[PDB]
Amino acid sequence: SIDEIYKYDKKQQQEILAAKPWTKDHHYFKYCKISALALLKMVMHARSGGNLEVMGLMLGKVDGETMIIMDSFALPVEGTETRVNAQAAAYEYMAAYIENAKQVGRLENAIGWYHSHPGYGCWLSGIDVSTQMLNQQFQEPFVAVVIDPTRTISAGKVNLGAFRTYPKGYKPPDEGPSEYQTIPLNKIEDFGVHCKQYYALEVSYFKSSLDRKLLELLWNKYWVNTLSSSSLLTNADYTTGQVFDLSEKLEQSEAQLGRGSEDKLAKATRDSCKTTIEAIHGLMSQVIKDKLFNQINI
């Protein structure tokens, strides 16, 4: 039975809460299972606001080293990324939402907070790290999630991240590859400083029996939306912007060759591909359609 996870054992939670394998090992939690609903609503919350970062709250539970996220919702706050802990404005709508939600079915407890990062990867800024450190300080099992809606679109797949911060004192172990994503230079500094102070979590996605069976029945009529998709005028103001970012990254490495952070043409080359790889992939689905619907004759 797939619905092993949509079950919620409440007494098991409060035994782990008391036991605490997180006060013993600093990097205990390493995995993160994201539900069907949780993914959709978080992606929907990020894009709905769009250009502006907005954060909400996640609900979930713990199991082994996996911090499972079951359900999510929004926090009507402002100044995400510009304020350290911007959720303080609506302390009312955190507890008041879970008090209402527990009457109707959502028994799940506070598991974390998520925010959107439109057009610049998934990572924790210096403002985000100060939020999460103090979140872990008091309100324990709390995981900071990030999603990039504008690139999720252009890249053509779920652009998402799940992170946890380390203590101010103890410093991380060695094993860390960490994959590269284009960071706009305006932000590269902020990232660059506080980037090594935290560690990510291995993301995995699950679903129920009904969800799985519904999505299969849903696909009978959803193939139509795939071949009238067109990721061009949808996210037009990411690709047109990335150019502005790309231009600056070259401008630096050009003068770097001259008189005068290690070969910033190798980054810019990867960015020029990254951004254009998308632009080309876009025109694949376009010609695919011109082939299909236009070329039948009468």
The rounded distance, in Å, linking the Cα atoms of 169 and 291 is: 61
Q: Which amino acid is at 139?
A: Q
The rounded distance, in Å, linking the Cα atoms of 289 and 298 is: 17
Q: Which amino acid is at 252?
A: Q
Q: Is 27 annotated as a binding residue?
A: no
Which of residues 19, 215, 227, 283 is near other proteins by CB under 8 A?
215
Residue 6 to residues 2, 185, 251, Cα–Cα distance (Å):
9, 42, 52
Q: Is 115 annotated as a binding residue?
A: yes
Interaction partner, residue 220 (Zn ion, other proteins, none; CB < 5-8 Å by kind): other proteins
- For Cα atoms 213, 201, 75, give the angle at the middle one, nearest 5 degrees: 70
Q: Closer to other proteins by CB, 2 or 17: give it.
A: 2
Longest dimension (CA), the chain: 74
- Label residues 200-224 b or e (16+ Cβ within 10 Å = b): bbebeebbbeebeeeeeeeeeeeee
From the CB of 175, what's the least distance to Zn ion, in Å?
25
| Binding of Zn ion by 128 (CB under 5 A) | yes
| Binding of other proteins by 281 (CB under 8 A) | yes
Interaction partner, residue 128 (Zn ion, other proteins, none; CB < 5-8 Å by kind): Zn ion
From the CB of 18, what's the least distance to other proteins, in Å?
24
The rounded distance, in Å, linking the Cα atoms of 286 and 280 is: 10
| Binding of other proteins by 272 (CB under 8 A) | no
Q: Which residues bind other proteins (CB under 8 A)?
A: 3, 6-8, 35-37, 39-41, 43-44, 46-48, 56, 71, 73-76, 90, 93, 96-97, 100-101, 103-107, 149, 152-153, 156-158, 205, 207-212, 214-222, 224-226, 228-229, 231, 234-235, 277, 281, 284
**Binding site feature residues for Zn(2+):** 115, 117, 128
**Binding site feature residues:** 115, 117, 128
